């Protein structure tokens, strides 16, 4: 086995000259020389079986990550892991490299209004497929946008994603949730789970006014702070929003607030193109019953140079199941992992 700054990192024979690209804390990552096809890959380390809930995302994501296959959402390429359950320590991810994301890009670079059309077009691209096989990402945002050179883009990290499940979305007002505060739809603080379609565009939204103006537009300190930042810009809700809204603790703090004038988005982003606004406002809409979907999204005028239905496909196999993975000991989910990750094993 071999070094990388610190741990072990053997990945065997058929990779070769490592290089540190980060423990990003979804393990340890570093590309390497792929013998095989004689192209850089990415690994990423995984250690999950020391905590259960590492575990049961480490074996949502595998399961999604094969079942899916489109040019805007990352593969795997290879697994590495011992050849025997009692061995089996680490598991290796094999994917495509990419040189960037998102977030770091948009740290440094201006993004042209092109480009910011392009980028838009990948996410959701990606994101109808994804939604067509009745998933939801749930933690869209930069970092997870992956870029290479030519700003071809992949959506990553379905370590929060879901089957679909919009009857059992109610829940009591401020209710715990586990994704990223600033792209989250202002109805889970409200009254949702994150169970609906409409929390991933909102998510997009979110990514879409922060390509316009490099800066994210809803930077909430904590939880409850998420939600008077959106109220700060849409303004208060409307009597019919309110109205949709049968949870009175969430309704009457809604009540209780001053009344909020909304911000137009021209002055937002004066510089930007206005059917890109057009667009953010249908994304950004407060009452998820009347937020824009993502083929309408792929259909709007600012799209229309790279709109193709026939050219955007959707799944083969919906997952019309959740994966019931909560009451299962720690045992169940490393044997799973295990016969998930048999396809790349020799024999």
């Not at 680490?90 to 209004?113: F, G």
């Not at 998420?226 to 949709?244: A, T, V």
């Not at 999204?297 to 709109?307: F, R, S, V």
Request: proline share 6%.
């Amino acid at each position: 086995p071999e070094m990388v700054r610190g741990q072990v990192f053997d990945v065997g024979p058929r990779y070769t000259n490592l290089s540190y690209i980060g423990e990003g804390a979804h393990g340890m990552v570093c590309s390497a020389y792929d013998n095989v096809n004689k192209v850089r890959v990415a690994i990423k380390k995984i250690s999950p079986f020391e905590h259960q809930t590492y575990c049961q995302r480490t074996l949502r994501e595998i399961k999604i990550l094969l079942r899916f296959r489109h040019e805007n959402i990352i593969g795997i390429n290879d697994i590495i892991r011992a050849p025997t359950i009692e061995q089996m320590k680490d598991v290796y991810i094999v994917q495509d490299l990419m040189e960037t994301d998102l977030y770091k890009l948009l740290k440094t670079q201006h993004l042209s209004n092109d480009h910011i059309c392009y980028f838009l077009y990948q996410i959701l691209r990606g994101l109808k497929y994804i939604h067509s096989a009745n998933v939801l990402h749930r933690d869209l945002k930069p970092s997870n946008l992956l870029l290479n050179t030519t700003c071809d883009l992949k959506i990553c990290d379905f370590g929060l994603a879901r089957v679909a499940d919009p009857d059992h979305d109610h829940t009591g007002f401020l209710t715990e949730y586990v994704a990223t505060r600033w792209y989250r739809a202002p109805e889970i603080m409200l009254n949702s789970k994150g169970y609906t379609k409409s929390i991933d565009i909102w998510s997009v939204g979110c990514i879409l006014a922060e390509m316009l103006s490099n800066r994210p537009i809803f930077p909430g300190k904590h939880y409850l702070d998420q939600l008077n930042h959106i109220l700060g810009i849409l303004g208060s809700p409307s009597q019919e929003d309110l109205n949709c809204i049968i949870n009175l603790k969430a309704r009457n703090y809604l009540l209780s607030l001053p009344h909020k004038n909304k911000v137009p988005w021209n002055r937002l982003f004066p510089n930007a193109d206005s059917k890109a606004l057009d667009l953010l406002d249908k994304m950004l809409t407060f009452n998820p019953h009347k937020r824009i979907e993502v083929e309408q999204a792929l259909a709007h005028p600012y799209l229309e140079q790279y709109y193709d239905p026939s050219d955007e496909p959707i799944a083969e196999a919906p997952f019309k199941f959740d994966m019931e993975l909560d009451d299962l000991p720690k045992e169940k989910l490393k044997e799973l992992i295990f016969e998930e990750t048999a396809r790349f094993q020799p024999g």
